[PDB]
């Protein structure tokens, strides 16, 4: 089991760490069919998504996808500093796998 | 996959963008049968609904309808600035599809 | 579809609007068997319940009842001004059908 | 249907009302197997539990047990004054049945 | 039934109490397949996880795992002082079984 986001991210293929050390600039959420997703942006122009749930996700990830969207909404509203994000760079916008928060 | 709300909204028929750049003036919700819905207003007189779930919605959308109501309530209570709404304009009140917040 | 709480309330028999324009003075909740309910009061001595969920409530109302209790708790805790309540007046205490908040 | 916590509490055997009129001093929560519970304390030394779900609880109480633990956590973190608790006094620690908040 | 976290922790093998008396330094969460987990750290260097749900967890522990992650996230975001953690010391990082908060 990994002890931090960087080591967790290294267990997966096609992932990358982005270091933001910044609060979320914008939070977007959609209930429209086939686009049930969240998008966040940062000041520096980075855009990330939480993926629409789909056949590519195992059952155990479903509750974790809904948790991530909850986390990003409350992070946004509290102006919490996002340290790092682990993302899948094979999606556009890049797709969030993990988040760390520190300040 | 769209990268912002405007591009998302363009994926659907019968939608338009509003750019409020304002907090929600009023928040209403109902638990009455066949009217389990939220209504929000803005200082400028605009009125929007989150629709009663129904045939127009597929199964993946039910969780997102609930999340949208959660998002609107906490945005109201935090006085969070709404940047844009994507809404369906063949409903009265216009029906929310997506929201962006930025300040 | 109604555009406000007052028009929504009028669609039901045995309802009326209370206009409080005040924060919730007390919040009570119960997990006791057959009394899984909430009760709120206002400084003017008005008392209202969220009903125990039952057979008089269709499935779509079950989620909405739980949301409403969530709403009242967080409204209480943030001292949010309640504008109006739509309530069934054929229950004692009068039972909440809808709420609007504005300040 | 009762209109306050004291009358609700008096509908049950083996209960009494504690009047705290004080914030929660400590909040404890456990996920350990067979001890999935919460424990709160007050400055006066009083200690109360939300019980582990089990056969003494009817199906309608399961969501309300979860709601209560959510309520105690947010009350703790907001320093919300707890007015009264209705508790079962045949459990050790005494087990919460209902809570009222007012300040 | 135990009345405090120390006595609760003593009911289990492979556990120990850490007395932190400190807010959470970082919060990390992951939706990644098979690492649906949370990691917290403290200023003193200590690292703890909430375990990926698994065969070592009975079905009653599943809601509580979800709650604990909710609790850690809101604690981090309110800078809530964590008094004690009961952790399993046969996992790496040590895995949270219980938390107490007081300040
Ligand atoms: C609003 C807009 O147009 N924004 C773009 C940025 O793209 C957005 O954000 C990124 C993270 C992706 O989610 C995009 O889909 C999204 O539109 C854009 O960021 C770059 O996007 C690239 C992917 O299209 C790529 O991720 C790039 O970073 C990687 O590639 C560059 C090549 O120059 C470098 O090798 C980086 O080291 C590498 N990073 C890795 C592998 O972790 C993104 O660029 C980086 O992130 C930006 C936010 C910014 O900090 C850049 O300086 C940095 O290189 C940027 C590109 O400038 O333009 C718009 O802001
Ligand atoms: C009201 C009481 O408070 C503490 O003193 C506990 O030890 C008792 O069991 C009871 O829960
Ligand atoms: Ca600010
Ligand atoms: Ca801080
Ligand atoms: Ca204001
Ligand atoms: Ca702000
Ligand atoms: Ca006040
Ligand atoms: Ca206000
Ligand atoms: Ca204080
Ligand atoms: Ca107050
Ligand atoms: Ca601080
Ligand atoms: Ca405090």
Residue numbers in the entry:
A (entry chain D), B (entry chain C), C (entry chain B), D (entry chain A), E (entry chain E): 1 to 103
Quote from the publication.
Crystal structures of the cCTB and ET CTB complexes with A-penta-BGA were determined to a resolution of 1.4 Å and 1.6 Å, respectively. Even in those cases, the B-factors of the terminal carbohydrate residues GalNAc and Fucα2 were disproportionally high compared to those in the other structures, suggesting that they are less tightly bound (in cCTB, the electron density of the GalNAc residue is slightly better defined). It is noteworthy that in the ET CTB structure exclusively, Gln16 often has a different conformation and points away from the ligand-binding site, thereby weakening the H-bonding network to the ligand. Notably, the GalNAc residue is close to Tyr18 and not Ile47, the substitution of which restored binding activity. In addition, we observe a conformational change of Gln16 upon binding of A-penta (BGA or HMO), which suggests that this residue interferes with binding in its native conformation.
In response to environmental stimuli, the bacterium produces and secretes its main virulence factor, the cholera toxin (CT). There are two major biotypes of V. cholerae, classical and El Tor, which produce cholera toxins with a slight sequence variation (cCT and ET CT). cCT and ET CT differ in only two residues of the B-subunit, His18/Tyr18 and Thr47/Ile47 (classical/El Tor).
